[PDB]
Design a binder for this molecule. Structure first.
Ligand SMILES: Nc1ncnc2c1ncn2[C@@H]1O[C@H](COP(=O)(O)OP(=O)(O)O)[C@@H](O)[C@H]1O
Ligand code: BEF
Ligand SMILES: [Mg+2]
Length: 426
RNA sequence: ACACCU
């Protein structure tokens, strides 16, 4: 087993000199909470504290990044220290670079990939488009250290993915099913995997994904570092997560309860199911009169996604849809059209609810309320990325009554006005 | 339900 160098974080003197109270005040200013009893390095507060290669710093400055986000301030040094961790922070607040840039430093301290060598960093994600997005970010920065990456996911030909794995990648981004296929058939292996990331980790630990995660992680060396990330960390996944963690540290940004990004204006319209169509058209007529009008509309099922899109297109709306019954080339094409703005309206199932970072989305519409309050927080987080603001509009019916209590709590935490009809439902 | 190999 090639030796795993784990001790390479060098704390900057500007960070090391802070006293414990000063650290607590820095965390307070950034709304960082570290779970009690965990060992945790002091947070950094500038990119030059974070041990990054000069070429990574060059790329960061070229993209006009000036200061790490809160989850980066605490997550960079925790990840760099080699500790297992859980990092929870709001949608759009920079979790991807929080785990990718320490991955690059980690990789740079390991022996070079030989032949027959699988990846050093493995990132798991719940959807194919999110895996592709993370790989694009990783390539942007991994190229600085001459690192190779690939994306392993279903619906695309196996051959090119097998080629990339056999050529050698230090960084592999994957959805679980196709990776399991390749592990079972010997197209890659996890004997060099020492940095394992579960992005959208609470989703990856849910009823459908947890057995896939378990099958994968059972094949990885137990001396690996494991890093889990999400905007939501409900109690239900916390004990289960310990099956995949060893001596770990949990960090949070924002309130400890379930919380949305506070840059989102959250509007809830309480209505009957039969009123949704008319109300949607009214809303879209106002949205499409604006200059910045890029909109995602979420629905509950693939069938409703197809039906709503056809209904909208039949009336001349420039809408396209994405869901799991489309071919992967269709899914890729639609999302690229949405990113470019050639199609300003995307209608989607929860396939598009997590992780996707489309810069100029201004509106998220919950045509159907989702199955959980966590799903609501992720969906509305497709707007208000980075420092941007955005608006979410939700249609909430009496059929959704069971979800009302938790929705009210999310609205209250974000200091949003609560529709009296929603209150009257409880 | 929604994702997630074939
Ligand atoms: N330190 C930073 N300053 C400004 N923008 C950033 C910074 N870090 C990341 N971003 C940008 O913020 C956006 C959201 O990042 P992302 O990693 O997708 O969020 P999350 O995973 O937390 O939902 C991305 O476009 C990313 O380039
Ligand atoms: F939480 Be980010 F939207 F992935
Ligand atoms: Mg993310």
């Amino acid at each position: 087993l090639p030796k795993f160098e784990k001790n390479f974080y060098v704390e900057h003197p500007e960070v090391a000199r802070l006293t414990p109270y000063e650290v607590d005040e820095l965390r307070r200013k950034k709304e960082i909470t570290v779970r009690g009893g965990d060992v945790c390095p002091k947070p950094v507060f500038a990119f030059h504290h974070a041990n990054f290669p000069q070429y990574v710093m060059d790329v960061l400055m070229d993209q006009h990044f000036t200061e790490p986000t809160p989850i980066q301030c605490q997550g960079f040094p925790l990840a760099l220290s080699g500790r297992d961790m859980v990092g929870i922070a709001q949608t759009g607040s920079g979790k991807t670079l929080a785990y990718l840039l320490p991955a690059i430093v980690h990789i740079n301290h390991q022996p070079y990939l030989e032949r027959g060598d699988g990846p050093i960093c493995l990132v798991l994600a719940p959807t194919r488009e999110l895996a592709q997005q993370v790989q694009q970010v990783a390539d942007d920065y991994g190229k600085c250290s001459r690192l190779k990456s690939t994306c392993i996911y279903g619906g695309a030909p196996k051959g090119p993915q097998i080629r990339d794995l056999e050529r050698g990648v230090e960084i592999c981004i994957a959805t679980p099913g196709r990776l399991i296929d390749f592990l079972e058939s010997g197209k890659t292996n996890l004997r060099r995997c020492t940095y394992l990331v579960l992005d959208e980790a609470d989703r990856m630990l849910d009823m459908g994904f947890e057995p896939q995660i378990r099958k994968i992680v059972d094949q990885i060396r137990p001396d690996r570092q494991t890093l889990m990330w999400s905007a939501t960390w409900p109690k239900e996944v916390r004990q289960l997560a310990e099956d995949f963690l060893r001596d770990y540290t949990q960090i949070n940004v924002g309130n400890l309860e379930l919380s949305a990004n506070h840059n989102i204006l959250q509007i809830v319209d309480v209505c009957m199911e039969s009123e949704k169509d008319h109300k949607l058209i009214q809303l879209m007529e106002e949205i499409m009169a604006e200059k910045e009008n890029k909109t995602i509309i979420f629905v509950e099922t693939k069938r409703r996604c197809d039906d709503l899109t056809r209904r909208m297109r039949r009336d001349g709306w420039p809408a396209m849809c994405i869901h799991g019954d489309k071919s992967q080339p269709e899914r890729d094409w639609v999302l690229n059209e949405f990113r470019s703005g050639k199609a300003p309206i995307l209608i989607a199932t929860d396939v598009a609810s997590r992780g996707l970072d489309v810069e100029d989305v201004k509106f998220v519409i919950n045509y159907d309320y989702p199955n959980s309050s966590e799903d609501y927080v992720h969906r509305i987080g497709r707007t208000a990325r980075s420092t941007n603001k955005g608006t979410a509009y939700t249609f909430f019916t009496p059929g959704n009554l069971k979800q009302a209590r938790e929705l009210i709590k999310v609205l209250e935490e974000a200091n949003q006005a609560i529709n009296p009809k929603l209150m009257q439902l409880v």
